[PDB]
Symmetry: C2
């Protein structure tokens, strides 16, 4: 009864922390239907001051420089770490419930953080999965596209940071292992193209 | 004979070495008598010899916690810092971006954990508020109340305090301030509503 309205307020607040505000969003936040909304929210004594600051700011963005500055505030405050909006930086089972929610919603926040699946550990773990669950062509393609395309660089920079050399050796072995695996996969994959063509 | 499962095991081993710092239990399983056989055999491949011997000589050389802590320090000061060799592909670089769609699914299913200093994505306030929005219409009042008191109201004021200190113009502080006041008023409505169902 009142819940859909509450969901709506939480969504709006969420959107404001999710990512910086672009032209399309600004137009959505300052339209007539949005103006009435902000007014209604302002009627509550505990919300009045905050609602006026938010609404007067958004209504004051008339050019590109105005929108760009607000975004700079967003980036300067949340994408540097500053006041990163992560609970753990200021302070259990309902994190898993959210984990699923995250996976389901396809809702991702603006972030300067590297993509988790871009972690070498993840790529290798996934390749291990491809070895027994995919065609050789998919395995080869993945090694050439996502692994062999950058290890050399990683290794190079690793040799300038690892004094001991343990992890430099691990990286070195990984590339060597990948190259040899690619050489075993090439003919296999090529046989299938010579056969699926004739 | 099928070698695909053997290849997967090797990729997993390499995966583990970048996945997290080596701990006591892991050092033991990486240096067991069965493991020594594996390394020796792997070292016989001409292309692998040098790095393998560096790998195992290092692992076999670990005989006290000091040396172990030293390796763990190498790991952290190399991958977990951020300036000097993060293991992320994007940081060193066509059908690339499209293969990331399947990895996310595998990453969600494998529930594989990579040691990291980055905060959890679900810990982000925007994701918590979106989740709360969801609970508002697909959950009992008590689950909503519980989540607010437990995950939001517990740290929001600390956040607003710091935010207010870094926000010169003050727009985002106003958003954060309105958020807390919204959450508090909502908890105020939720408590009476929930308590009543015990009657």
């Amino acid at each position: 009864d009142i819940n859909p309205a509450r969901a709506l307020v939480y969504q709006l607040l969420s959107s404001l922390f999710a990512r910086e505000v672009d032209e399309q969003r600004l137009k959505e936040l300052t339209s007539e239907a949005a103006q009435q909304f902000w007014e209604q929210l302002s009627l509550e004594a505990n919300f009045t001051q905050s609602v006026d600051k938010i609404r007067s700011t958004l209504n004051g963005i008339k050019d590109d420089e105005a929108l760009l500055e607000l975004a700079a505030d967003y980036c300067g405050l949340f994408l540097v770490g500053s006041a990163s909006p992560y609970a753990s930086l200021y302070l259990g089972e309902q994190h898993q419930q959210m984990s699923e929610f995250l996976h389901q919603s396809k809702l991702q926040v603006q972030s300067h953080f590297p993509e988790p699946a871009d972690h070498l550990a993840v790529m290798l773990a996934y390749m291990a999965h491809l070895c027994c669950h995919s065609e050789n062509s998919v395995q080869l393609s993945f090694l050439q596209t996502c692994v062999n395309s950058w290890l050399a660089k990683f290794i190079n920079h690793l040799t300038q940071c690892n004094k001991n050399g343990f992890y430099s050796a691990v990286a070195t072995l990984t590339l060597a292992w990948v190259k040899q695996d690619i050489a075993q996969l090439e003919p296999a994959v090529a046989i299938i193209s010579l056969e699926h063509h004739h």
